[PDB]
Paper text:
OxyR, one of the major ROS-sensing and -responding systems identified 35 years ago in enteric bacteria Escherichia coli and Salmonella enterica serovar Typhimurium (S. Typhi), is an LysR-type transcriptional regulator (LTTR) that is characterized by having an N-terminal DNA-binding domain (DBD) and a C-terminal regulatory domain (RD). As best illustrated in E. coli, OxyR (EcOxyR) becomes activated when a disulfide bond is formed between two conserved cysteine residues located in the RD as a result of oxidization by H2O2 (6–7). Most OxyRs belong to the dual-control (type II) group, acting as not only an activator of peroxide‐scavenging enzymes under oxidative stress conditions but also a repressor of the same target genes under nonstress conditions. In this study, we attempted to unravel mechanisms for functional irreplaceability by carrying out comparative analyses of type I EcOxyR and type II OxyR of Shewanella oneidensis, a representative of a large group of Gram-negative facultative Gammaproteobacteria renowned for their respiratory versatility and the potential application in biogeochemical circulation of minerals and bioelectricity.
To better understand why EcOxyR cannot function as a replacement of SoOxyR, we determined the crystal structure of the RDC203S of SoOxyR, which should be locked in the reduced form with a single point mutation C203S, as the mutant could no longer form the disulfide bond C203-C212. The crystal structure of RDC203S of SoOxyR was solved to a resolution of 2.4 Å by molecular replacement. The RDC203S of SoOxyR polypeptide chain, which contains residues 91 to 304 of the full-length protein, was traced unambiguously except for the last four residues at the C terminus and a six-residue loop from amino acids (aa) 179 to aa184 that were structurally disordered. Each RDC203S molecule is made of six α-helices and eight β-strands that fold into two domains, RD-I (residues 91 to 164 and 274 to 304) and RD-II (residues 165 to 273). As expected for a reduced form, the disulfide residue pair C203S and C212 in SoOxyR RD are found at the opposite ends of the helix α7, with the −OH and the −SH side chain measured to be 13 Å apart from each other. There are six SoOxyR RDC203S molecules in each crystallographic asymmetric unit. Through interface-I, RDC203S monomers assemble into dimers with an average buried surface area of 1,268 Å2. The second-largest interface (i.e., interface II), which buried a surface area of 561 Å2 on average, further assembles RDC203S dimers into tetramers or dimers of dimers. Interface II is mediated by α10 located at the very C-terminal end of the protein. α10 from two neighboring subunits pack against each other in an antiparallel manner, forming an interface that is largely hydrophobic in nature.
Residue numbers in the entry:
A (entry chain A): 91 to 175, 178 to 299
B (entry chain C): 91 to 179, 185 to 298
The structure:
Amino acid sequence: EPMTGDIRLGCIPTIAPFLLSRVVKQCQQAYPEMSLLLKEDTTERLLDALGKGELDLLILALPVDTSGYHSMKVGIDPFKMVIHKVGGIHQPIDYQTLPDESIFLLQSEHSITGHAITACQLGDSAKVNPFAATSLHTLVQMVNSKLGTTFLPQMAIDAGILNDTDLVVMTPPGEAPYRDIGLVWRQTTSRILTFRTLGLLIQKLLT
Amino acid sequence: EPMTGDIRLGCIPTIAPFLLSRVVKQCQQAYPEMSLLLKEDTTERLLDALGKGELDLLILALPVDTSGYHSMKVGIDPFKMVIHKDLVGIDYQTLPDESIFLLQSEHSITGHAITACQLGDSAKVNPFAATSLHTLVQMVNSKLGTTFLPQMAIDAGILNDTDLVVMTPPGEAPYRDIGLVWRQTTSRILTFRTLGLLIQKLL
């Protein structure tokens, strides 16, 4: 029964595009009798889906509200800020130097907006472009068009989201500028061995 | 004032990462006094925002429900089926079950690819229910199935640093139309036609 059967897995669109294929291919090779029924959605709808019984496991970015659930941290990944290679000004980043609507952020339903704001210490909301984005690939294209800057997760950079771009990587304002990756499941699960195995595989996948 | 002032423009996630940056770049170079207040969202939510006044202009497809609005077609982009480089060889029902990767019905590209490629067998669809074509590209590059892709994604380099090859899907009209949608009672007729010509030249 462990590592066998149908498991309905949820993963947020800031994690799934550059982790999920390696998660699924390894489980196909090592556990071919386990069928992962995936779903890509944002955090609140994913936790709700776990509440209704729609899903059994969620791959989330950890600092969210997981009340009534069990949550296991499986890794960290830092934040970076990207600019076209031609406006590199100063490495210790002052947010007040930047022009007015020049920091692109996803719609606030994506947890990466709040995580990047709190972790990289963005205090001036006037610095935030009024783009209501949903894809970080769109923002990478916007920054590559010299239209501003954005925060990128490290796991996006390591999978070549900056390929075919003139973007460069900077270190954001410090004081723990990272994001926790974690696994979420119901407290009444009967598949704790499977979820701990998936967590160990994901943690090892987060190099 | 044509190309001056605030314009609230919405774009679907299956078009935006391949055209929106170039649209905004050319607009702020040729018309620097027009501010594009942008939004990425799916077709029904963009239509709801257009009807309630939250947005003024939408970049969508043509074959969606645009009752009570004005649609202008600005071009086409073909549908192409992409597969891993090792896995190759009119594309009939040879494919196994749960193999075609499709986005949720929330995104119009699913219905567009289904109707334009004559996909009548749902059993060949993998039950992913995705939202991002880049995730599906990563899944196909891991030898996990097929997916449909718009030509504008391939032109923007979505197959770069992958091992995917392009195949012609079995459709009589294997393409998707692109269009601009706005309220019929608008006064910015010249601005919207200008942006439509701009997008049409870009496509």
